[PDB]
């Protein structure tokens, strides 16, 4: 998928994605998978 702005909401839902990074939200993630370094992969909807 293309780059998706990480401004979905402010529902601070820090989801841990395969990489060891707690993304403020699955969308913030979209920012990660869009301009992070590697295609992370959610694993736990929290602080790991």
What domains, with CATH codes, occur in the chain? 1-48 (3.30.60.30)
CB neighbourhood size of 28 (10 A): 21
Experimental method: NMR
Cα–Cα nearest to 4, from 25, 33, 39: 33
CA 43/CA 34 separation, integer angstroms: 18
User: What residues contact residue 37 under an 8 Å CB cut-off, 6+ apart?
Assistant: none
């Amino acid at each position: 998928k293309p780059d998706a702005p990480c401004i979905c909401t402010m529902q601070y839902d820090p989801v841990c994605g395969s990489d060891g990074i707690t993304y403020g939200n699955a969308c913030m993630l979209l920012c990660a998978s869009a301009r992070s370094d590697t295609p992370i992969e959610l694993v736990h909807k929290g602080r790991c």
